[PDB]
Design an enzyme around this catalytic site. Structure first.
Site, mmCIF file in Angstrom:
data_model
loop_
_atom_site.group_PDB
_atom_site.id
_atom_site.type_symbol
_atom_site.label_atom_id
_atom_site.label_comp_id
_atom_site.label_asym_id
_atom_site.label_seq_id
_atom_site.Cartn_x
_atom_site.Cartn_y
_atom_site.Cartn_z
ATOM 1 C CB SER E 117 15.267 -3.655 -1.454
ATOM 2 O OG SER E 117 16.078 -2.511 -1.697
ATOM 3 N NE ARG E 118 8.267 0.406 -1.944
ATOM 4 C CZ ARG E 118 7.002 0.480 -2.362
ATOM 5 N NH1 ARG E 118 6.653 1.283 -3.355
ATOM 6 N NH2 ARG E 118 6.072 -0.236 -1.745
ATOM 7 C CB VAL E 119 17.416 1.204 -2.857
ATOM 8 C CG1 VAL E 119 18.912 1.130 -3.154
ATOM 9 C CG2 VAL E 119 17.018 2.633 -2.519
#
Ligand code: ANP
Ligand code: ANP
Ligand code: PIT
Ligand code: MG
Ligand code: MG
Lengths: 157, 466, 479, 54, 128, 466, 128
Positions: E117-119
């Site tokens: 997940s990039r968040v």
């Protein structure tokens, strides 16, 4: 790939990141056997910096060519100086990892900035054998060599 | 009105009309021929010219030759008197038993049942084949797909299914030979006469035959499926009944498709194929379906070119099926028949709430030990049995006994196997693999599980081995 | 002047002649170039005809006159083609003067549909022990011969051809078999040697050879099999039996790829055209067994396919396996070790031949298949060593040289020896020796029994008991 | 008696490990070139289709 | 609509592989020259503009959001192929599933190394 | 008659002719150039325009520059006056010794001998070289692949082959340098002068050289083979000889044809080879053969791209080879000359029905004993040589003694060494190894058989060793 | 100029991959036919006419010379790629370098088993 392949030559330093390395949790996932710099030369960074670096790649490359081999042929058959370069490379790989200030949301770890000399010294020391008694996971996701030693005690209980 | 040929190239013929341009899909009758040569309008090239596809050989055609619009697409007989008869792509009788005299006719091109016409009911169809009924069971009114490379067992499996499922089913059946062997047609036809599911003198016939085999030109193979299909639609809709539909082989429809697409002057897509591969197949597949109005249980043989299941033809086929049975050359070459890949065949009713928790648990257990064993096979191939821990040896021994017990002698394959054919009740299949997983037969030697039916036969073969 | 029966060449050079005019030509009709070359109308376009050239298109120039011949591509046909070597068009190439041919048949005729056929049932005796017993063939069947270069493929075809003399010198007309050898892509010297071989064996007098060699133009190589096939159909449709050899179809597909790429047909898997399957499928569909109401005739087709490194999974190999009724697979490894004919039994099948195998062969064969099935599974306890003992020996029995095909009764007596345990006591390096000493002994002394087996098509309970004596008597005296 | 059987068996095991490996070298070598040929052909058909569409 | 009117929406695209197949079809019949794997040269853009429209708006624009879950089918476990990498290179992370994990009993068959997940933890409650 | 250049695109030139058009394959002479510019007609485009492939650079050509149709394909000088000469692809001398003055010229494009013109017999072409004749013998008119590459006796073997065939069979040789490296062509020419096979003083020369250097256009390198081939066809056809034709190298004949194909706008086939791969090869190869008048035998050097024997280039090639001579570096490092591998080198005519029952059995014994000598070398390393059985002690001696007798001194290297060379007659070869296998020379020292002619000179070498 | 007037020159072409690429550009844009890797049919010719101009002249012609060290970049050490195939075929030998040797501390990273010079001993002093 035409695109990235044509780009290398426009560059003075190349940091190449690898999925295989990211997959192991090693971040930044920089491939130490494929990243280069024009100034990686003793006349420039000095003989101390250059020798260490070259050493790190040496043990890492030596390890890489033993990997697929001892994976099937068993660990125990190795020479006691070979299976030390196995233990040392595996630590240096981890010591290459580092918690980033901008990746706190990804790591859980606090960001750490390592001054140049401390990086050279830390690795110099691992190659020397000064930490063969320290556990692998002690060098993982830390800043300077001190925190690997500190992390070693927290893992002792 | 009346049109003139201005171009011919294999299956593809262009025809110019001065007034009255026939719509796309309209069937055109070429004049001056001894047997009926239908062209289907494919595109409107413009300049009062249409591009068409031939349903038969185009040797003899001259520029200038006359063509008539029939006013509709290919229409074919449908209804009760298609039963016992063999027709071609254009509905002509091909059994030399005269006119086919139905009240109804249908167009081979129809739109697919609407979204509101779908049925939601999922009920297991027990085949008596262990591997299928266990790991990836079929469903009444569902879409079954039989994947396999050249010579691995597609047609044996379908024939076996016809034996095991059709006979004991009070409905009608349609078999559509599509781009396959003619002598197999000849086999299938007489076999049915011998068994009386086709009667040549009664009205008691239960199967209708539609054939356009690998001697036909591409248009014919490109459309035979639609014919065969269409006959199945009638029986599903205009009776509400339970229809079985066997196609061998559906891949041949896309391949045929591939052959005319070059000539139709399309820019090709991946691996040379027609860039309409997906939608072509979709418009055709979506017609092969159970509706609120009546159920069709379809079993289609699907050929894999070059053993490549990543090839556009089969790759695109997967998403049209409710159950897959992927056959594996490698497995067949080890002697396991049917050569089912147990970790590549799937079914949408493999769910604890449909097949019951017991069935689901054993299946997942069987597939677990088979995958763990598959992971261990590289360590095996260099260093062999000996280098494994005591535990791995057990997963190996059990998996190998499980692979063998997945095999089965088919009544249709008795000449190749040397064993009388076997058909195993679903319970017996479960209990057999269950027992091999609990370790109950760890003491038995593998060979006992090869080519048997119920678990009890494996036991008997073990004692027989002394 | 006349552009209805005639055209002039617009462009030439891609092996395709663009021809202005020819307004009344048919699709697939033969045309005739001013230089004597034949051609085929392929593309009937608004302002030209695409003509495939049945020879060297160096000889065609812009402006050349082309004439209709009125006929869809066909070829000479009938019995006068026996003992002849022809090119792909039918013109004689053996320089023995014209073919005195009386009928002609289209090269593209669609294979017989469903009704006129019946499942195969008459043996097609190759004379090769391993084949006739393990991979048996019936008249009307298509059996693929497949393997890497130099594995013994042609050999299978040749001994088969040569084997038929035994019947072709009888007066039993239904028992006969006329042969056609289609050379697509071969060396001409190879073909020339071959007919010499056939002539030497007096087999050529019942063979037609169709030749389209390495230096013939591609269109010729592609045509040859169909030309070959019509010649066969003459016999099929006339109450007679024909065997045809497509040697080899790998090379022919190569011929066709060259034509399609030049015609700018979109390349697919291995640059082969979409219709590469159809190329072979329609051809081999034409091999068939006809029921008694259509003569009872038959055409048997033995196509040859050349694998690269034993890879049966490649595009063209699998297309043809997806067409024919089983395969004889020939392994490089088996051939190397001198195991000959190099047949991989496991990977070889006849989908339909069991029905057309004599009872006499079936009685020794079924148990041989079985004991060889057991032996492959285990390549120091009582049972599993005996299947090794038996196995190596049956393996030696299947060995066989060339140009000595065997009568069916001779094959079974030899296998009888094997499957009745008489070979178990001897050493593997002596089975070949025992086989020849034994086979010639029974031929010279026990003719009555061998004849009776051929005549009865069976091993009777007397014959068996009589053949139990002959073997025991011989084995005890074999030194 | 123990080491006679050990080096005997090890000799055999490694003989078989080596021979297995050798058989595996060939099989992968065949695959490589089958892949090698397909990639090349694939790359080429992509180029041709691209030029022909103009 | 929800996004720009202070509401939150979730959109599944099942699947964009098949969409790509359909755009490749449309593009080739319009005589637009094929590109890599027969798809058009802008197959990336096809998915890039679609998915950039999943977005979190600030308070001045309503506080609404749209969350996307594109679906991509791979061929024989190759997350690294041209099309797969295109889409990974659009989205804020990926969940990669594998058959081997699936049948080993690891269901959901999420491969941890290759998923992201990039968040990150910003999308989690403090508790999680 | 005379046409005009209308289009120049790299090495492709299009010419327009107002009247009669030059047929395909015709040679065109471009005017107004300092050196000869030949254009081979490749196609007829329509509108009176031909497409040609240039035999030299096209720099400088102007649209409108006159082009004379010679009326024939490329014609080159043939006959005995070519021996010792180096010509290029269009028949000009490039050894700077002045015109090649022959009474005949011949076209480089000829159709293959007809079916009737073929010898139905298979004859050995005795080379006089022991290894070859015994184990991998040459078919009269067959083709032979030469593997090895550099520093393996490749030039010496060629030169000895030329010499031995002139002596024993009274035939000459031709060397076709397809993609010859200028440097290496200079070296080979001199190496030939120094060994005698070319003689610049009188007329005793045995080879004729045809060089297609790498820096020449695609069409040049594609055609050199043909040029040399025709030089060879003279000797077979007009003089009744059994001729040797060397092609170096056959892979660059393929590639050159692939490049020509690519320039003509044709679609590449599998792996980017010309679609006419097989035919290009076929029309050149079939000319190499035995007619009733004589034979051309060809020794062809092979490069295997990617080490892939299934690459279309070597695949296609192998279809025409009847034998392989394999030159190995391993064997050279053991001092065996010629560096021929006796296990790797095969022949199609190694068949008792062709070479005789006897010649067969000896070869197969020599092959067997060398195979079995390879089986023991591990046990030699493990247990030493004195832990062999008494039958096994012999196999080693004999094997090692056979190994050396396969070596042999070459005439072509009499200058370099001081040792007299040997052309060994076939029957003495057969006999020597026949007698070794039987142990008729076990008592003789191992080193007696090394670098020797017939078996008598081994006994002679053993008696001289003090 | 040096070769012909009695002297010796050394030429380094750095590199030829990139040269070929520039020519591939011109050919494709000139709409000449693309081949393997979209290179035209005269790409071997391009490089072969350059490298033949390296040469040792005889005394009659001044006795000078031009030596060529062409440079070729491989991709993942694919010596069987079209352009590398061309220059390997063309040259008299190759100095192959490897990345694994490099990081093994073997610098210069010359593979000694694979590198060759067909000129060989002919260009060494008796000492070496
Ligand atoms: N039964 C046999 N016993 C002994 N030798 C044989 C036998 N069959 C074939 N051979 C030999 O093996 C060689 C190859 O056989 P052939 O029939 O040419 O196979 P092929 O695969 O069809 N050849 P090709 O088409 O050139 O690849 C020939 O030289 C024969 O002499
Ligand atoms: N269940 C089975 N038991 C035993 N043998 C089998 C079985 N299935 C296939 N075979 C063997 O494989 C052969 C081919 O079977 P078939 O059903 O034609 O496969 P297929 O996939 O339809 N062939 P094709 O259509 O050419 O790809 C049979 O003749 C058998 O010898
Ligand atoms: O086994 C093979 C052999 C081969 O020779 C080619 C392919 C695939 C080729 C291909 C070519 C162009 C495309 O755009 C494409 O998707 C696929 C596969
Ligand atoms: Mg089938
Ligand atoms: Mg053959």
């Amino acid at each position: 790939d035409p695109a990235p392949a044509t780009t290398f030559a426009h560059l003075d330093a190349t940091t190449v990141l690898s999925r295989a390395i990211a997959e192991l949790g090693i971040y930044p996932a920089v491939d130490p056997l494929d990243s280069t710099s024009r100034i990686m030369d003793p006349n420039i960074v000095g003989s101390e910096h250059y020798d260490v670096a070259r050493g790190v790649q040496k043990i890492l490359q030596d390890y890489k060519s033993l990997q697929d081999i001892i994976a099937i042929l068993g660990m125990d058959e190795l020479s006691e100086e070979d299976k030390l370069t196995v233990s040392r490379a595996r630590k240096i790989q981890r010591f290459l990892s580092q918690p980033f200030q901008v990746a706190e949301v990804f790591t859980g770890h606090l960001g750490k900035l390592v001054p140049l000399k401390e990086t050279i010294k830390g690795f110099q020391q691992i190659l020397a054998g000064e930490y063969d008694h320290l556990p692998e996971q002690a060098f993982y996701m830390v800043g300077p060599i001190e925190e690997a030693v500190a992390k070693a005690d927290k893992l002792a209980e | 009105t009346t049109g003139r040929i201005v171009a011919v190239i294999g299956a593809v013929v262009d025809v110019q009309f001065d007034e009255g341009l026939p719509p796309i899909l309209n069937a055109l009758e070429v004049q001056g021929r001894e047997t009926r040569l239908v062209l289907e309008v494919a595109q409107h090239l413009g300049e009062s010219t249409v591009r068409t596809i031939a349903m038969d050989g185009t040797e003899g055609l001259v520029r200038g030759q006359k063509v008539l619009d029939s006013g509709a697409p290919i229409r074919i007989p449908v209804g009760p008197e298609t039963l016992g008869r063999i027709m071609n792509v254009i509905g002509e009788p091909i059994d030399e038993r005269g006119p086919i005299k139905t009240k109804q006719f249908a167009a081979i091109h129809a739109e697919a049942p609407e979204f509101v016409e779908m049925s939601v009911e999922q009920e297991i169809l027990v085949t008596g084949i262990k591997v299928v009924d266990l790991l990836a069971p079929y469903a009444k009114g569902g879409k079954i797909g039989l994947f396999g490379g050249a010579g691995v067992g597609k047609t044996v499996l379908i024939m076996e299914l016809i034996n095991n499922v059709a006979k004991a089913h009070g409905g009608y059946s349609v078999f559509a030979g599509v781009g396959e062997r003619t002598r197999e047609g000849n086999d299938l036809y007489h076999e049915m006469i011998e068994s009386g599911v086709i009667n040549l003198k009664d009205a008691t016939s239960k199967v209708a035959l539609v054939y356009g085999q690998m001697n036909e030109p591409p248009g014919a193979r490109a459309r035979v499926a639609l014919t065969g299909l269409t006959v199945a639609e009638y029986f599903r809709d205009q009776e509400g009944q339970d229809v079985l539909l066997f196609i061998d082989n559906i891949f041949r429809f896309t391949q045929a498709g591939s052959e005319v697409s070059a000539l139709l002057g399309r820019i090709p897509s991946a691996v040379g194929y027609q860039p309409t591969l997906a939608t072509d197949m979709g418009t055709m597949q979506e017609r092969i379906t159970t509706t609120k109005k009546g159920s069709i249980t379809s079993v289609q043989a699907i050929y894999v070119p070059a053993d490549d299941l990543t090839d556009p033809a089969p790759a695109t086929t997967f998403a049209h099926l409710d159950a897959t049975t992927v056959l594996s050359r490698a497995i067949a070459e080890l002697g396991i028949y049917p050569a089912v890949d147990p970790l590549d065949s799937t079914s949408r009713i493999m769910d604890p709430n449909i097949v019951g928790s017991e069935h689901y648990d054993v299946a997942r257990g069987v597939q677990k030990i088979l995958q763990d064993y598959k992971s261990l096979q590289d360590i095996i191939a260099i260093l062999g049995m000996d280098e494994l821990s005591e535990e791995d040896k057990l997963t190996v021994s059990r998996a190998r006994k499980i692979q063998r017990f997945l095999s089965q002698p088919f009544q249709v394959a008795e000449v190749f196997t040397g064993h009388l054919g076997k058909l195993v009740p679903l319970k017996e299949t479960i209990k057999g693999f269950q027992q091999i997983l609990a370790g109950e037969y760890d003491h038995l030697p593998e060979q006992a599980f090869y080519m048997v039916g119920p678990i009890e036969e494996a036991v008997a073969k073990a004692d027989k081995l002394a | 002047v006349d552009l209805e029966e005639t055209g002039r060449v617009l462009s030439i050079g891609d092996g395709i002649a663009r021809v202005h005019g020819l307004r009344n030509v048919q699709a697939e009709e033969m045309v005739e170039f001013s230089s004597g070359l034949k051609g085929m109308s392929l593309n009937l376009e608004p302002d030209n005809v695409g003509v495939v050239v049945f020879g060297n298109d160096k000889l065609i120039k812009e402006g050349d006159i082309v004439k209709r011949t009125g006929a869809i591509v066909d070829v000479p046909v009938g019995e006068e083609l026996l003992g002849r070597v022809v090119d792909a068009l039918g013109n004689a190439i053996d320089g023995k003067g014209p073919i005195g041919s009386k009928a002609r048949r289209r090269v593209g005729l669609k294979a017989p549909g469903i009704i006129p056929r019946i499942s195969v049932r008459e043996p097609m005796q190759t004379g090769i022990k391993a084949v006739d017993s393990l991979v048996p063939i019936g008249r009307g069947q298509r059996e693929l011969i497949i393997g890497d270069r130099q594995t013994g493929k042609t050999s299978i075809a040749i001994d088969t051809i040569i084997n038929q003399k035994r019947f072709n010198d009888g007066t039993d007309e239904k028992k006969k078999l006329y042969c056609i050898y289609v050379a697509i892509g071969q060396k001409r010297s190879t073909v020339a040697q071959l007919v010499k071989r056939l002539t030497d064996a007096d087999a050529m007098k019942y063979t037609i050879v169709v030749s389209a060699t390495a230096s013939d133009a591609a269109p010729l190589q592609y045509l040859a099999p169909y030309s070959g096939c019509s010649m066969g159909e003459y016999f099929r449709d006339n109450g007679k039996h024909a065997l045809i050899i497509y040697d080899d179809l790998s090379k022919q597909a190569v011929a066709y790829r060259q034509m399609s790429l030049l015609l700018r047909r979109p390349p697919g898997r291995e640059a082969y055209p979409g219709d590469v399957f159809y190329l072979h499928s329609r051809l081999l569909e034409r091999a068939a067994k006809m029921n008694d109401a259509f003569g009872g005739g038959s055409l048997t087709a033995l196509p040859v396919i050349e694998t690269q490194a034993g890879d049966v999974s490649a595009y063209i190999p699998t297309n043809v396996i997806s067409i024919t009724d089983g395969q004889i697979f020939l392994e490089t490894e088996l051939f190397y070790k001198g195991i000959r004919p190099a047949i991989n039994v496991g990977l070889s099948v006849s989908r339909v031949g069991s029905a057309a195998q004599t009872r006499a062969m079936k009685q020794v064969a079924g148990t041989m298949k079985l004991e060889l099935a057991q032996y492959r599974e285990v390549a120091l306890d009582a049972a599993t060593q005996q299947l090794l003992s038996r196995g190596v020996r049956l393996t030696e029995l299947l060995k066989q040289g060339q140009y000595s095909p065997m009568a069916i009764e001779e094959q079974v007596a030899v296998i009888y020896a094997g499957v009745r345990g008489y070979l178990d006591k001897l050493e593997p390096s002596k089975i070949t020796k025992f086989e020849n000493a034994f086979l010639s002994h029974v031929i010279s002394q026990h003719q009555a029994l061998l004849s009776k087996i051929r005549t009865d098509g069976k091993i009777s309970e007397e014959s068996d008991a009589k053949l139990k004596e002959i073997v025991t008597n011989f084995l005890a005296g074999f030194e | 008696e123990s080491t006679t059987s050990e080096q005997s068996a090890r000799m055999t095991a490694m003989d078989n490990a080596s021979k297995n490996a050798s058989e595996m070298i060939d099989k992968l070598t065949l695959t490589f070139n089958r892949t090698r040929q397909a990639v090349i052909t694939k790359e080429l058909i992509e180029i041709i289709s691209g030029a022909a569409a103009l």
